[PDB]
Scaffold this motif. Structure first.
Motif, PDB file in Angstrom:
ATOM      1  N   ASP A   6     -28.479 -53.652  -1.620  1.00 60.40           N
ATOM      2  CA  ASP A   6     -28.666 -54.945  -2.265  1.00 60.40           C
ATOM      3  C   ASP A   6     -27.616 -55.961  -1.833  1.00 60.40           C
ATOM      4  OD1 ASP A   6     -30.927 -54.121  -3.671  1.00 60.40           O
ATOM      5  OD2 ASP A   6     -29.736 -53.364  -5.353  1.00 60.40           O
ATOM      6  N   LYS A   7     -26.460 -55.501  -1.355  1.00 57.17           N
ATOM      7  CA  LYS A   7     -25.409 -56.394  -0.891  1.00 57.17           C
ATOM      8  C   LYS A   7     -25.523 -56.735   0.588  1.00 57.17           C
ATOM      9  CE  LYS A   7     -21.946 -54.914  -4.290  1.00 57.17           C
ATOM     10  NZ  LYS A   7     -20.597 -54.317  -4.487  1.00 57.17           N
ATOM     11  N   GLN A  12     -30.625 -64.297   4.927  1.00 57.61           N
ATOM     12  CA  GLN A  12     -31.049 -64.530   3.547  1.00 57.61           C
ATOM     13  C   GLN A  12     -31.790 -65.862   3.424  1.00 57.61           C
ATOM     14  OE1 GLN A  12     -27.797 -64.337   0.747  1.00 57.61           O
ATOM     15  NE2 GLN A  12     -29.115 -64.397  -1.070  1.00 57.61           N
ATOM     16  N   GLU A  13     -32.009 -66.541   4.552  1.00 53.61           N
ATOM     17  CA  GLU A  13     -32.623 -67.863   4.512  1.00 53.61           C
ATOM     18  C   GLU A  13     -34.086 -67.789   4.095  1.00 53.61           C
ATOM     19  OE1 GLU A  13     -31.994 -69.609   8.323  1.00 53.61           O
ATOM     20  OE2 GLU A  13     -29.855 -69.984   7.995  1.00 53.61           O
ATOM     21  N   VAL A  14     -34.806 -66.764   4.558  1.00 55.15           N
ATOM     22  CA  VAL A  14     -36.237 -66.670   4.278  1.00 55.15           C
ATOM     23  C   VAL A  14     -36.482 -66.540   2.779  1.00 55.15           C
ATOM     24  CG1 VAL A  14     -38.325 -65.332   4.683  1.00 55.15           C
ATOM     25  CG2 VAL A  14     -36.703 -65.711   6.553  1.00 55.15           C
ATOM     26  N   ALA A  20     -37.043 -67.914  -5.303  1.00 53.57           N
ATOM     27  CA  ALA A  20     -35.694 -67.822  -5.842  1.00 53.57           C
ATOM     28  C   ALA A  20     -35.147 -66.401  -5.836  1.00 53.57           C
ATOM     29  CB  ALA A  20     -35.654 -68.377  -7.272  1.00 53.57           C
ATOM     30  N   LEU A  21     -35.996 -65.404  -5.590  1.00 54.75           N
ATOM     31  CA  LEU A  21     -35.600 -63.995  -5.551  1.00 54.75           C
ATOM     32  C   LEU A  21     -34.935 -63.556  -6.855  1.00 54.75           C
ATOM     33  CD1 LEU A  21     -35.445 -61.404  -3.826  1.00 54.75           C
ATOM     34  CD2 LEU A  21     -33.213 -62.195  -3.013  1.00 54.75           C
ATOM     35  N   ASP A  25     -41.994 -67.779 -11.046  1.00 52.51           N
ATOM     36  CA  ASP A  25     -41.495 -69.105 -11.396  1.00 52.51           C
ATOM     37  C   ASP A  25     -41.684 -70.085 -10.244  1.00 52.51           C
ATOM     38  OD1 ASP A  25     -40.731 -68.317 -13.958  1.00 52.51           O
ATOM     39  OD2 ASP A  25     -38.746 -67.663 -13.284  1.00 52.51           O
ATOM     40  N   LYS A  26     -41.053 -69.806  -9.105  1.00 54.53           N
ATOM     41  CA  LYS A  26     -41.131 -70.665  -7.930  1.00 54.53           C
ATOM     42  C   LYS A  26     -42.115 -70.061  -6.936  1.00 54.53           C
ATOM     43  CE  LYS A  26     -36.450 -72.559  -8.306  1.00 54.53           C
ATOM     44  NZ  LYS A  26     -35.128 -72.713  -7.638  1.00 54.53           N
TER      45      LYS A  26
END
Length: 42
Positions: A6-7, A12-14, A20-21, A25-26
């Motif tokens: 997870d780290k 991380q742009e995609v 919003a990961l 919602d989005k």
DNA sequence: GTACCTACGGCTTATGATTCTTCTCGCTTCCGGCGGCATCGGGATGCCCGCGTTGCAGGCCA
């Protein structure tokens, strides 16, 4: 699957730009198309 | 003029977990010393007689 962390993140742009990961919602850009070359690496 | 990222596969080495070695707490209870007294078998001491020990000289052995 080869390295699940997870780290671990480099771009991380995609995930940041599509949602919003969590995602209900989005829902921006409901339609996405992936263009890719016709070679084997594609 | 120069720098930093991962996929394709294998052995190792840099560190948290489990079975084998070891360090030694608890006292208490059945058991092992411990002392005194009657008992019994041995033997040291004495005498007699034949056998175990030793010196001489020869034939055999390491």
């Amino acid at each position: 699957e080869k390295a699940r962390f997870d780290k671990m993140l480099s771009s991380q742009e995609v995930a940041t730009l599509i949602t919003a990961l969590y995602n209900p919602d989005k829902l921006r850009y409901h339609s996405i198309i992936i263009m890719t070359d016709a070679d084997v690496d594609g």
